Every structure is written in C-alpha cells, then in structure tokens.
Amino acid sequence: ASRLLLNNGAKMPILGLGTWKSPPGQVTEAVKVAIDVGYRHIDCAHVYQNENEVGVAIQEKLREQVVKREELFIVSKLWCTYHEKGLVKGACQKTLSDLKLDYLDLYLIHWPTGFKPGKEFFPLDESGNVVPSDTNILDTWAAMEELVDEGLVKAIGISNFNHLQVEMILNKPGLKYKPAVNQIECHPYLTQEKLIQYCQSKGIVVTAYSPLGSPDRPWAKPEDPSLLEDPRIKAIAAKHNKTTAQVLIRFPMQRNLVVIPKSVTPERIAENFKVFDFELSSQDMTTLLSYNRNWRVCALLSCTSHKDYPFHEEF
Numbered sequence: 365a366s367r368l369l370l371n372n373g374a375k376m377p378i379l380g381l382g383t384w385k386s387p388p389g390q391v392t393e394a395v396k397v398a399i400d401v402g403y404r405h406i407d408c409a410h411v412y413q414n415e416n417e418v419g420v421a422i423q424e425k426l427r428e429q430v431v432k433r434e435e436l437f438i439v440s441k442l443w444c445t446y447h448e449k450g451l452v453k454g455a456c457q458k459t460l461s462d463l464k465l466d467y468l469d470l471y472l473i474h475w476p477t478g479f480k481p482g483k484e485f486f487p488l489d490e491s492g493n494v495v496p497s498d499t500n501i502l503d504t505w506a507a508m509e510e511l512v513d514e515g516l517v518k519a520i521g522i523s524n525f526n527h528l529q530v531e532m533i534l535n536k537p538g539l540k541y542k543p544a545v546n547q548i549e550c551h552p553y554l555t556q557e558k559l560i561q562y563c564q565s566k567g568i569v570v571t572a573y574s575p576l577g578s579p580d581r582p583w584a585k586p587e588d589p590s591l592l593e594d595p596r597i598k599a600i601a602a603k604h605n606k607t608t609a610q611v612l613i614r615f616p617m618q619r620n621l622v623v624i625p626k627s628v629t630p631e632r633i634a635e636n637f638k639v640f641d642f643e644l645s646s647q648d649m650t651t652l653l654s655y656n657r658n659w660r661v662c663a664l665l666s667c668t669s670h671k672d673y674p675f676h677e678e679f
C-alpha cells in the first residue's frame with residue numbers, strides 16, 4: 365500500500381526520506397518540508413553527524429500538531445564502533461537524545477563489521493588500516509534484543525548483511541526477535557534479485573538505499589555511470605510523463621521494497637513524493653531489471669579484509 369507490515373505487527377511507510385550527506389545547516393528545513401509534504405518515515409544514523417538537527421525538525425512538527433508521534437516512523441542505526449555488548453544501550457540512548465524521542469521505531473545494525481571502540485568512526489592502526497573489534501554478529505544481536513525488552517526501540521534490524529549473515533541470526537540458539545528489516549543498496553545497476561528473494565521468503569522486509577545511484581557520494585568519479593542520466597531510463601520516464609527520479613523511486617515500490625531517496629531541496633523532496641499515482645508496466649519492470657551491472661556505490665573498501673566483510677559472498 366503506502367505501508368508494509370513488519371513481523372512485529374507495526375506498519376512501515378514504503379517511502380521515507382534519507383539524510384546521509386544532508387548538511388546540518390539544511391536538514392532541519394528539509395525534514396520540516398518532507399513532513400509537511402506527507403513523508404512519515406525518516407532514515408537516520410549517528411554516523412551522519414546530523415541527528416540533533418533532524419530532531420529539531422521532528423520536535424517542531426510534533427509541537428505544531430502536524431503529525432502525532434505514532435504516525436511517524438523514525439529509523440536509526442548502530443555504528444560499527446559500538447558493537448560491544450556494553451556499548452549498545454549507550455549508542456541508542458545517544459541517538460534518542462539527539463533526535464529528542466523516547467523510542468525508535470526501528471534500530472539497525474549499520475554494518476556487520478565491528479571496529480575498535482573510540483571517538484574515531486574509522487579507527488586506523490599505524491599502518492593506516494581499520495582496527496577490528498573481536499565481537500561477532502550474534503553477541504551484538506543479543507544486545508539489540510535487550511533494547512526491545514527495555515522499551516527503547518519497537519523493532520530491530522540489520523543493514524548490509526549478506527544471506528549467510530542473515531542465516532546466522534535466524535539460526536541463533538534462543539533467538540528471541542527476528543530481524544524486521546534488511547536495508548541494502550538497490551537500483552537498476554545493482555538489482556539484488558537473489559538477496560531480495562531470500563529475505564522476502566523469510567518474512568524480512570527489504571529497504572532499498574541509494575535508489576537514485578547516490579550522485580552525491582563523496583567518492584564519485586566522472587567516468588562513473590549515472591542512473592538519472594541513463595537515456596534508456598529517461599525514455600521510460602517520458603512515456604509516463606514523469607521524471608527519471610520518480611521512475612527510479614517507483615521501481616523498488618513495485619518490487620514490494622521500502623525506498624528512502626535523500627534530498628535537501630524542497631522541490632525535489634516534493635517531486636519525490638509524487639510516485640503513488642502511476643504504475644510501471646511489467647515490460648518496464650523487466651526492462652529496468654535487465655540493466656543490472658552489479659555496480660555498488662557503497663562497498664566499504666577499507667574493510668575488505670575484515671572477518672565480517674559482507675560482500676565476498678555472492679548475495
């Protein structure tokens with residue numbers, strides 16, 4: 365619909381607003397405009413360094429009575445430096461403070477890789493490599509389940525997990541809460557048919573990130589492919605009298621995925637919301653799928669030898 369049922373009984377808005385790369389000086393206004401426009405789902409993370417400013421916008425709109433809190437669906441993520449059992453509740457409460465909420469709707473493990481705790485988000489050794497924690501996925505999962513029993517979060521999930529890492533949690537002895545959601549990269553150049561089939565067969569909702577190809581990723585190279593400018597995708601958009609961004613947002617929706625485009629620009633935030641009024645045909649869908657080239661925006665290239673690096677497995 366406009367909302368999908370999670371395995372905890374709550375319903376997640378199929379469209380949300382992303383906030384990675386959203387400057388602290390612009391994001392409060394961006395989230396205020398989104399909520400005005402009809403967004404009810406905001407994707408956040410501590411590592412984005414803008415949760416305080418996101419929270420100012422949420423507070424203003426609650427105070428104004430534009431939305432009730434129970435109508436909002438607010439998501440954040442546990443960063444890699446807080447995977448230790450004793451650091452997890454603390455990371456969560458910090459995010460809750462910044463956002464000025466008393467619970468999250470969904471809390472995700474941001475990446476499966478744990479790093480050494482500290483103030484640096486990517487701790488480097490003297491050789492400049494990332495320092496790993498010796499924690500594993502299962503112990504971090506048990507700390508996350510705690511958060512649900514304490515009332516801090518309603519649902520817990522994972523992000524950038526491959527299918528064997530998901531398996532690992534599902535087979536955990538004494539598993540109390542299943543992951544509700546696996547948030548992964550997904551667009552016409554990285555279609556994820558195998559992992560999406562796997563998660564959906566297990567009752568795990570998939571959220572597509574970087575749906576537009578992340579044209580503002582800080583590592584962008586000029587030779588690099590561009591989804592928004594692909595003439596094949598422009599043609600499908602023209603047929604439907606929509607923009608190529610609106611086609612790229614509608615595509616995961618028809619695959620029963622949640623999608624979270626990022627924008628700090630009021631007219632684009634508005635434009636990105638107008639995707640409930642049209643339908644891609646099944647020929648269009650099959651065509652977009654055929655464009656897959658296994659191209660990833662986010663490959664976490666500094667952690668390619670971490671014991672828990674997710675992207676050595678096929679799916």
Ligand SMILES: NC(=O)c1ccc[n+]([C@@H]2O[C@H](COP(=O)([O-])OP(=O)(O)OC[C@H]3O[C@@H](n4cnc5c(N)ncnc54)[C@H](OP(=O)(O)O)[C@@H]3O)[C@@H](O)[C@H]2O)c1
Binds near residue numbers: 547572
């Ligand atoms: N879990 C993870 O590891 C992870 C990783 C990456 C992303 N995500 C989440 O997914 C969100 C989305 O992915 P993303 O931020 O990489 O990129 P994206 O949503 O694929 O693209 C954002 C870029 O596209 C532009 N854009 C938005 N609407 C547009 C439109 N209608 N027409 C033209 N350009 C448009 C934005 O410009 P303006 O802002 O200038 O308007 C921004 O430059 C993130 O913000 C984050 O919340 C999660």
Ligand SMILES: C[As](C)(=O)[O-]
Binds near residue numbers: 384409411662
């Ligand atoms: C690309 As990210 C900052 O959501 O790990």
